[PDB]
Paper text:
[name] is the major staphylococcal fibrinogen (Fg) binding protein and is responsible for the observed clumping of [name] in blood plasma. Starting from the N-terminus, [name] contains a signal sequence followed by the ligand-binding A region composed of three domains (N1, N2, and N3), the serine-aspartate repeat domain (R region), and C-terminal features required for cell wall anchoring such as the LPXTG motif, a transmembrane segment and a short cytoplasmic domain. [name] binds to the C-terminus of the Fg γ-chain and a synthetic 17 amino acid peptide corresponding to this region was shown to bind to [name]. A crystal structure of a Fg-binding [name] segment (residues 221–559) which includes two of the domains (N2N3) demonstrates that each domain adopts an IgG-like fold.
The mutant ClfAD327C/K541C generated a stable, closed conformation form. Surprisingly, the closed conformation of the disulfide mutant ClfAD327C/K541C was able to bind Fg. The crystals of the [name]-peptide complex diffracted to a 1.95 Å resolution. Two copies of the [name]-peptide complex were found in the asymmetric part of the unit cell and are referred to as A∶C and B∶D. Although the 13 residue Fg γ5–17 chain synthetic peptide was used for crystallization, only 11 residues were identified completely in both copies of the complex. As observed in the apo-ClfA221–559 structure, the [name](229–545)D327C/K541C N2 and N3 domains adopt the DE-variant IgG fold. The C-terminal extension of the N3 domain makes a β-sheet complementation with strand E of the N2 domain. This conformation is locked by the engineered disulfide bond as predicted by SDS-PAGE analysis and confirmed by the crystal structure. The C-terminal residues of the ligand is docked between the N2 and N3 in [name] and makes a parallel β-sheet complementation with strand G of the N3 domain, whereas in SdrG, the N-terminal residues of the ligand are docked between the N2 and N3 domains and form an anti-parallel β-sheet with the G strand. Tyr338 in the N2 domain and Trp523 in the N3 domain play an important role in anchoring the peptide molecule. In the [name] model, we believe that the peptide may thread into the cavity formed in a stabilized closed configuration and therefore the [name]-Fg binding mechanism could be called “Latch and Dock”.
Residue numbers in the entry:
A (entry chain C): 400 to 411
B (entry chain A): 230 to 299, 303 to 452, 456 to 476, 479 to 545
Write the structure that this text describes.
C-alpha cells in the first residue's frame, strides 16, 4: 500500500 | 463607449514562478494598473485580453472577476474568455481616477494538454505583458504494477456537483483482478457525497496510453456496462473490471455531488488494488484536493473641480 496526491486551484 | 485605448499610465504583469504545477495548486496572477480618463462616464467600458492558455476558473465551473472597489466597475468574462469591465456612475463625478486589479488565472487543461514551455501574455489595449514558463503536470503514481492518477474539474458550487477524472493503470501494466475504490480523504471533513443517487460513474477503455492528456482533459471505447460498479460502504464506490486481468489503461469519469453543509472541501482518495505476476496483493492510493483563490480590485478618485 502506497500514496500520492494532487491539489488543484480554482476561482472562489 | 469603449475607452480601453483612452486609459493612461497602464501597466501589466504576470506573477508566477518559472515552473507552474497545475496539479500542485499552482496558478498565476495577472496584475493591471491604469489611470481612467476624467471624461469617463457610467456605462463606459474597457477590455482585458486573456490568452487561450489560461482560464479564470481552474477547478471551478465558472468564475467572477473582482469588481473594482473604491463600486468603481463591474466585470464579466466574454465568450472569447476576455474580461469586460463596465464603469459605474462613480466616474460621473470623480476625477483623476486610478485603479489596480489582480486576477488569479489557471493553466487551461484543454489548450495546454502536455507538459512543456508556455509563453503567457495578457494586456489592456496595446500595453501587454508576457512570460514564458514550463507547465509541469508531473507524473502519475506507481507502486509495483499499480499505477493511478486523478484530477478534479468543474466544481460547481451553484449546483453542488463535481467531476473527477481518474487514469487507472496509465502505465499499461498487467493487473490481475484489479479493483478501484473511490473514498473521501480521511480527516478532511470531505464534502463529497458518494452513493447511488449522488454518484454516476462511466469507464472507458484506452487503446494507447499515448492518446491520454497529461492535463487530464478527456474527450470521451465506453465499457461502463462491462464492469460492476457498487456502493459497498458509506461514501465509497467500487469498480470491478474474462481472464481477471487488465493490460491497458482505463479512464474512470465520476460525475458526483457535494454537501454544502459540510464543514470541509472536496477532498478525495481513490485506490487501486491488484495482484502482480507473483500473485501478491497490493494497493496504490491517489488523493485529490483543491484550493480556492480570489482576485481583487480597487480604485480611487477625487472630486472634480467646481468653479468658485
Amino acid at each position: 500500500h502506497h500514496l500520492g496526491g494532487a491539489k488543484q486551484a480554482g476561482a472562489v | 463607449t469603449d475607452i480601453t485605448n483612452q486609459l493612461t499610465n497602464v501597466t501589466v504583469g504576470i506573477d508566477s514562478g518559472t515552473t507552474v504545477y497545475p496539479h500542485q495548486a499552482g496558478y498565476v496572477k495577472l496584475n493591471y494598473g491604469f489611470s481612467v480618463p476624467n471624461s469617463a462616464v457610467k456605462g463606459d467600458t474597457f477590455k482585458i485580453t486573456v490568452p487561450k492558455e489560461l482560464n479564470l476558473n481552474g477547478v471551478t465551473s465558472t468564475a467572477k472577476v473582482p469588481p473594482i472597489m473604491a463600486v468603481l466597475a463591474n466585470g464579466v468574462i466574454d465568450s472569447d474568455g476576455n474580461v469586460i469591465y463596465t464603469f459605474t456612475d462613480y466616474v460621473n463625478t470623480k476625477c483623476d481616477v486610478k485603479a489596480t486589479l489582480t486576477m488569479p488565472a489557471y493553466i487551461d487543461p484543454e489548450n495546454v494538454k502536455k507538459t512543456g514551455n508556455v509563453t503567457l501574455a495578457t494586456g489592456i489595449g496595446s500595453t501587454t505583458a508576457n512570460k514564458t514558463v514550463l507547465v509541469d503536470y508531473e507524473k502519475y503514481g506507481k507502486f509495483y504494477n499499480l499505477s493511478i492518477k486523478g484530477t478534479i474539474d468543474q466544481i460547481d458550487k451553484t449546483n453542488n456537483t463535481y467531476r473527477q477524472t481518474i487514469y487507472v493503470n496509465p502505465s499499461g501494466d498487467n493487473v490481475i483482478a484489479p479493483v478501484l475504490t473511490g473514498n473521501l480523504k480521511p480527516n478532511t471533513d470531505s464534502n463529497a457525497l458518494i452513493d447511488q443517487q449522488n454518484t454516476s460513474i462511466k469507464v472507458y477503455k484506452v487503446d494507447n496510453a499515448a492518446d491520454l492528456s497529461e492535463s487530464y482533459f478527456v474527450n470521451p471505447e465506453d465499457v461502463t456496462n462491462s464492469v460492476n460498479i457498487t456502493f459497498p460502504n458509506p461514501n465509497q464506490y467500487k469498480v470491478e473490471f474474462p481472464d481477471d486481468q487488465i493490460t491497458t489503461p482505463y479512464i474512470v469519469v465520476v460525475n458526483g455531488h457535494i454537501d454544502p453543509n459540510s464543514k470541509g472541501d472536496l477532498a478525495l482518495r481513490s485506490t487501486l488494488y491488484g495482484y502482480n505476476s507473483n500473485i501478491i496483493w497490493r494497493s496504490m492510493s491517489w488523493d485529490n484536493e483543491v484550493a480556492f483563490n480570489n482576485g481583487s480590485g480597487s480604485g480611487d478618485g477625487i472630486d472634480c473641480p467646481v468653479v468658485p
